[PDB]
Amino acid sequence: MFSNIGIPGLILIFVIALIIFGPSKLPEIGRAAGRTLLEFKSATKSLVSGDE
């Protein structure tokens, strides 16, 4: 039924999101967040290090 579709069915749904969002919008967010997240781990390293 709707469970036997698996991923093949996901693409159809995903497209519904693309029309409203766009395939050039999801990658843009990841990249943008990518920079924000990148600095996150660096800040964390200082919390765990708690030393030189």
PDB file of C-alpha atoms in Angstrom:
ATOM      1  CA  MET A   1       0.000   0.000   0.000  1.00  0.00           C
ATOM      2  CA  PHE A   2       1.491   3.303   1.136  1.00  0.00           C
ATOM      3  CA  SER A   3       4.216   1.418   3.005  1.00  0.00           C
ATOM      4  CA  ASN A   4       5.383  -0.726   0.086  1.00  0.00           C
ATOM      5  CA  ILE A   5       6.359   2.440  -1.760  1.00  0.00           C
ATOM      6  CA  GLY A   6       9.430   2.987   0.405  1.00  0.00           C
ATOM      7  CA  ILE A   7      11.783   5.670  -0.916  1.00  0.00           C
ATOM      8  CA  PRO A   8      10.213   5.758  -4.443  1.00  0.00           C
ATOM      9  CA  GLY A   9       7.170   7.284  -2.753  1.00  0.00           C
ATOM     10  CA  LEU A  10       9.337   9.740  -0.820  1.00  0.00           C
ATOM     11  CA  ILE A  11      10.553  11.376  -4.032  1.00  0.00           C
ATOM     12  CA  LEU A  12       7.003  12.204  -5.084  1.00  0.00           C
ATOM     13  CA  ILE A  13       6.413  13.816  -1.693  1.00  0.00           C
ATOM     14  CA  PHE A  14       9.801  15.452  -1.732  1.00  0.00           C
ATOM     15  CA  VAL A  15       8.945  17.151  -5.009  1.00  0.00           C
ATOM     16  CA  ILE A  16       5.883  18.683  -3.373  1.00  0.00           C
ATOM     17  CA  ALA A  17       8.369  20.394  -1.098  1.00  0.00           C
ATOM     18  CA  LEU A  18      10.593  21.408  -4.006  1.00  0.00           C
ATOM     19  CA  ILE A  19       7.845  23.260  -5.791  1.00  0.00           C
ATOM     20  CA  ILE A  20       7.259  25.369  -2.670  1.00  0.00           C
ATOM     21  CA  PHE A  21      10.914  25.341  -1.535  1.00  0.00           C
ATOM     22  CA  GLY A  22      13.204  24.429  -4.460  1.00  0.00           C
ATOM     23  CA  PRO A  23      16.219  22.083  -4.969  1.00  0.00           C
ATOM     24  CA  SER A  24      18.486  25.146  -4.867  1.00  0.00           C
ATOM     25  CA  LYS A  25      17.140  26.126  -1.451  1.00  0.00           C
ATOM     26  CA  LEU A  26      17.846  23.008   0.566  1.00  0.00           C
ATOM     27  CA  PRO A  27      21.584  22.891  -0.397  1.00  0.00           C
ATOM     28  CA  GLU A  28      21.902  26.617   0.280  1.00  0.00           C
ATOM     29  CA  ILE A  29      20.684  26.189   3.850  1.00  0.00           C
ATOM     30  CA  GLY A  30      23.122  23.356   4.521  1.00  0.00           C
ATOM     31  CA  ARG A  31      26.016  25.441   3.242  1.00  0.00           C
ATOM     32  CA  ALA A  32      24.968  28.470   5.217  1.00  0.00           C
ATOM     33  CA  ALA A  33      24.435  26.408   8.355  1.00  0.00           C
ATOM     34  CA  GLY A  34      27.657  24.677   7.456  1.00  0.00           C
ATOM     35  CA  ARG A  35      29.645  27.786   8.370  1.00  0.00           C
ATOM     36  CA  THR A  36      27.641  28.348  11.532  1.00  0.00           C
ATOM     37  CA  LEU A  37      28.058  24.750  12.617  1.00  0.00           C
ATOM     38  CA  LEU A  38      31.734  24.766  11.741  1.00  0.00           C
ATOM     39  CA  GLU A  39      32.397  27.490  14.262  1.00  0.00           C
ATOM     40  CA  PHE A  40      30.229  25.607  16.776  1.00  0.00           C
ATOM     41  CA  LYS A  41      32.593  22.673  17.158  1.00  0.00           C
ATOM     42  CA  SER A  42      35.497  25.079  17.477  1.00  0.00           C
ATOM     43  CA  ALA A  43      33.761  26.848  20.355  1.00  0.00           C
ATOM     44  CA  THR A  44      32.951  23.490  21.920  1.00  0.00           C
ATOM     45  CA  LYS A  45      36.564  22.362  21.753  1.00  0.00           C
ATOM     46  CA  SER A  46      37.273  25.190  24.155  1.00  0.00           C
ATOM     47  CA  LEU A  47      34.553  24.074  26.580  1.00  0.00           C
ATOM     48  CA  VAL A  48      35.809  20.499  26.741  1.00  0.00           C
ATOM     49  CA  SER A  49      39.445  21.527  26.745  1.00  0.00           C
ATOM     50  CA  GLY A  50      38.885  23.831  29.705  1.00  0.00           C
ATOM     51  CA  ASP A  51      42.622  24.436  29.479  1.00  0.00           C
ATOM     52  CA  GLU A  52      45.520  25.415  27.220  1.00  0.00           C
TER      53      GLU A  52
END
